[PDB]
Enzyme design. Structure first.
Site, mmCIF file in Angstrom:
data_model
loop_
_atom_site.group_PDB
_atom_site.id
_atom_site.type_symbol
_atom_site.label_atom_id
_atom_site.label_comp_id
_atom_site.label_asym_id
_atom_site.label_seq_id
_atom_site.Cartn_x
_atom_site.Cartn_y
_atom_site.Cartn_z
ATOM 1 C CB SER A 147 106.543 7.834 63.019
ATOM 2 O OG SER A 147 106.348 7.051 61.889
ATOM 3 N N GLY A 148 107.618 7.366 66.007
ATOM 4 C CA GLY A 148 108.222 7.943 67.197
ATOM 5 C C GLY A 148 107.689 7.405 68.502
ATOM 6 C CD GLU A 159 96.729 15.967 74.633
ATOM 7 O OE1 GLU A 159 95.587 15.590 74.961
ATOM 8 O OE2 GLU A 159 96.990 17.068 74.108
ATOM 9 N N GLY A 163 101.656 8.396 61.463
ATOM 10 C CA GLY A 163 101.219 9.186 62.610
ATOM 11 C C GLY A 163 101.525 8.544 63.950
ATOM 12 C CG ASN A 167 89.690 13.839 71.989
ATOM 13 O OD1 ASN A 167 90.276 14.554 71.187
ATOM 14 N ND2 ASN A 167 88.467 13.374 71.724
ATOM 15 C CD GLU A 188 94.481 17.759 78.244
ATOM 16 O OE1 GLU A 188 94.158 18.259 79.364
ATOM 17 O OE2 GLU A 188 93.643 17.337 77.404
ATOM 18 C CG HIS A 211 110.899 9.110 60.548
ATOM 19 N ND1 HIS A 211 110.825 7.892 61.171
ATOM 20 C CD2 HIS A 211 109.631 9.471 60.249
ATOM 21 C CE1 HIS A 211 109.547 7.519 61.220
ATOM 22 N NE2 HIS A 211 108.808 8.487 60.691
ATOM 23 C CG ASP A 259 113.753 6.595 62.609
ATOM 24 O OD1 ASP A 259 113.951 7.812 62.867
ATOM 25 O OD2 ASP A 259 112.686 6.142 62.113
HETATM 26 CA CA LIG Z 1 93.489 16.390 75.288
#
Ligand SMILES: [Ca+2]
Length: 223
Positions: free
Chosen positions: A177-178, A52, A175, A54, A62, A40, A84
């Site tokens: 999700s996944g 990541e 947010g 922040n 990163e 989804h 899903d």
């Molecule tokens: Ca960052």
């Protein structure tokens, strides 16, 4: 994540953020080239963001890598959220290190009562809205299939499990999700859906990754 804690920077090294100009979903790194997320969450134009903490500040660990391909499960139904799950291939391989690391796939399904780690950058409020910058974490148990079905009559398939707390207050949320549900070092779930967030008698519902290991492995082997 509602009712969780600040993980700490790069303490969840398999957690990725999917970005399309903005964080929109989580995912899990399963090798240098491939991420597991929820179907989804599918959209075109995905950049995978690894390393990541922040998501609004460049902090130094990163890796930003565009997706080349995404593969939604062949039997995903967007109405029921059955199956899903989707795979995302990176255009270039990630450089794996202590802070950017794959998570193993399970060899057997997990059991109710197993404690797992759920993580993401989703909403931290159950009635309002507040989106965190840093990664949040929640330790939660898998719930019995009978409790899960009773919580969501007519909605829980064999490709779903519930995890969390029937009393409310501690859950994943929009947010997240996944993103991952990791138990004993294995990716057992993907954040999928629920009724609101952190509501009494409405635990989180997660895609049951163990059912998909053969599809994941054969898809990676030919793509
Ligand atoms: Ca960052």
């Amino acid at each position: 994540i509602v009712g969780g804690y600040t993980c700490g920077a790069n303490t969840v090294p398999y957690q990725v953020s999917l970005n399309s100009g903005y964080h929109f979903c989580g995912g899990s790194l399963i090798n240098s080239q491939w991420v597991v997320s929820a179907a989804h969450c599918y959209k075109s134009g995905i950049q995978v963001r690894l390393g990541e903490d922040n998501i609004n500040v460049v902090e130094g660990n990163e890796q930003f890598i565009s997706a080349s391909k995404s593969i939604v499960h062949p039997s995903y139904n967007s109405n029921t959220l059955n199956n899903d799950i989707m795979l995302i291939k990176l255009k270039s391989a990630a450089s794996l290190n202590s802070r950017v690391a794959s998570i193993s796939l399970p060899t057997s399904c997990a059991s109710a009562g197993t404690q797992c780690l759920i993580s993401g950058w989703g909403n931290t409020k159950s009635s309002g809205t507040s989106y965190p910058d840093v990664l949040k974490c929640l330790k939660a148990p898998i719930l019995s299939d009978s409790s899960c079905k009773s919580a969501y009559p007519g909605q829980i398939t064999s490709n779903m499990f519930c995890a969390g707390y029937l009393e409310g207050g501690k859950d994943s949320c929009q947010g997240d999700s996944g993103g991952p549900v990791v138990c004993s070092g294995k990716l057992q779930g993907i954040v999928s859906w629920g009724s609101g967030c952190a509501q009494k008698n409405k635990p989180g519902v997660y895609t049951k990754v163990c059912n998909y290991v053969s599809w994941i492995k054969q898809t990676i082997a030919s793509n």
